Every structure is written in structure tokens, then in C-alpha cells.
């Protein structure tokens, strides 16, 4: 039981990805997406999408590289994400 769920790549190009997930029926405050070359943590980046959003676009990627995309949900309106009680959902897309 994670939040969000059914994360996937809907549209993909050689240098961009469009990910989608199932926003829970109860809106969260915002999500935090972290992505990067699987293992290469000095390449990991992160951005935040509002709770109303259920899709995000990841651009500026390198071809043929295996990426890990993780989405963290923050239920708090006034606390950072490390206080969250939601297990993130993560996927992996190549290219």
C-alpha cells in the first residue's frame, strides 16, 4: 500500500519522459519526484508537483541510460517530506 500508485511512463522520447500515477482519492499536499541514472546518485535530481497533479514530465535525459523514477507523497501542509508516512512508488525506464 503505497502513495501514489500505478506509476508508469506514458510518453517517451530519446531525451524526455512523461510519467503518470494514480493520485489517491484524498488529495495530498504535493509530490516529490527524484530521478537519475540508476545508481549514479551524483546525477539524481528532484522536483515537486502539486497534489492536484497526477502526471509529470522529465526532460534532459541521456539515451540508452537506465533511470530510476521515484515519487514521494507529502500529506503535510506545513512539514517537510521526511515526516511523511507514505511509502514512495518507483519505476525504471531505459532511454
Amino acid at each position: 500500500s503505497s502513495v501514489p500508485t500505478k506509476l508508469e511512463v506514458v510518453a517517451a522520447t530519446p531525451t524526455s519522459l512523461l510519467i503518470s500515477w494514480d493520485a489517491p482519492a484524498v488529495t495530498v499536499d504535493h509530490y516529490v519526484i527524484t530521478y537519475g541514472e540508476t545508481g549514479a546518485y551524483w546525477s539524481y535530481q528532484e522536483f515537486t508537483v502539486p497534489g492536484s497533479k497526477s502526471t509529470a514530465t522529465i526532460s534532459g535525459l541521456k539515451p540508452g541510460v537506465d533511470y530510476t523514477i521515484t515519487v514521494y507523497a507529502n500529506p503535510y501542509s506545513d512539514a517537510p517530506i521526511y515526516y511523511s508516512y507514505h511509502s514512495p512508488i518507483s519505476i525504471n525506464y531505459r532511454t
Partner: protein, 126 residues
Amino acid sequence: TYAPLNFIAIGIGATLGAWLRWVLGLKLNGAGWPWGTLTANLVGGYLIGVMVALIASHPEWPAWIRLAAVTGFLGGLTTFSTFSAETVDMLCRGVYATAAAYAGASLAGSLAMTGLGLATVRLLLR
């Protein structure tokens, strides 16, 4: 001296500094960079260079002025626990470049701000 008026200057000082740090975190802590706590640390770092240099040239001030503004306000304004929690969380999620950039900005910037806080007082008297 463990005087009752001493505990009253710490509590009143930390209570104010904490509140200001809290509100800074709420309104400022951005989407990828903790501007709220970094602000409280840099500012607090600059204000201690002024207070320390100021308490040096005014040894006639009472013992509660330093315990209220340095041990009280700045003691509660800046934090290390909230800094390492945030930094450790960045490492947890894998953003090592951000954690490194955040640690550096906090450490170097705090030292330099505390330096500029001393240089301003010494330049002010000369």
C-alpha cells in the same frame, strides 16, 4: 550564576528565536532547497559575529544581555538538528549533489556570514 533571571532570559530568548525560525521554514523552505532554515542559519551566523564583536568592546553590559540575545535568540533561531535531518533526507532519497551543495552552503556560508558580522562591527568603530 544560575540566577532565576538568567533562566528567564534564555527561555524568552529561545522562544522568540524559535518562533522566527519556524515561520521562516513554513514560508520559505522551497521545493528543492531549504531556504527557511538556511536563512535562519546565515542570518543567525551574521548576527553572532556582530554580537560577539559587540560584547567584546562593551564588557560593561549585564550577563543577561548575552544570555538573552546570543544564548537565547540566536540559540533558538539557528539549528543543527533540522539541518542534518534535511541533509540526511537528501542522501536518503539519493540526491547527493544537493546534500553536498546544501552542506557546503550551510558550513561555508555560515562561517563567512559570521566573518562579515565581525568585519562590520570592527569597521563601524574605525
